[PDB]
Amino acid sequence: MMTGRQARAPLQFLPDEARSLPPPKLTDPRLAYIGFLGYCSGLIDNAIRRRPVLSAGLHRQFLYITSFVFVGYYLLKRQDYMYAVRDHDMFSYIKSHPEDFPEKDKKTYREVFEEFHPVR
């Protein structure tokens, strides 16, 4: 797909064009869901080692949710950048080739004809 787009400057997580986009907020619902994933991971880690799942190792659960939030925030930044790239490339190709995307008329319903199929 966009492989040639990642041909001149490869192995870049976030290029110089990714910084012109608004960063995701710290109260993003997806970030909260990834933090909840980290909390679930901490609960499972306490459960599989025969520890009290809601009391044992609060620092472990804190590091779990912190690392999850960190990685999820960076992945969400990359996802937003890639979707912006997709939209920008699509609009640039639409603008560049007007003959391949010609406008169509918008006929009102007083002119267009629709066949009627009775239900009886």
Partner 1 sequence: SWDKDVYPEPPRRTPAPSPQTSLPNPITYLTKAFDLLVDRPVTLVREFIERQHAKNKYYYYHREFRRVPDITECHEKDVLCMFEAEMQWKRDYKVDQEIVNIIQERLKACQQREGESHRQNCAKELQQFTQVVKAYQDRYHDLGAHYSARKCLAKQKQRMLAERKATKEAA
Ligand X SMILES: CCCCCCCCCCCCCCCCCC(=O)OC[C@H](COP(=O)(O)OCCN)OC(=O)CCCCCCCCCCCCCCCCC
- Contact positions vs partner 1 (CB under 8 A): 106-110, 112-116, 118-120
| Out of 1, 4, 11, 108, the residue judged to bind ligand X by CB under 6 A | 11
Classify 4 as helix, strand or coil. coil
Rule CB under 6 A: is residue 10 a binding residue for ligand X?
Answer: yes
Given the structure tokens 């969400």, which residue do they identify? 76
Sequence-distant (6+) residues with CB within 8 A of 88 are none
Task: Tell me the number of residues near ligand X by CB under 6 A.
Answer: 5
**Shortest CA distance to 24 belongs to which of 68, 75, 88?**
75
Instruction: List the structure tokens of 82.
Output: 């890639």
Work out how close the CB of 112 gets to partner 1 at its nearest, in angstroms, rounded to a whole number: 6
Work out how close the CB of 101 gets to partner 1 at its nearest, in angstroms, rounded to a whole number: 17
Binding site for ligand X (CB under 6 A): 6, 10-11, 13, 71
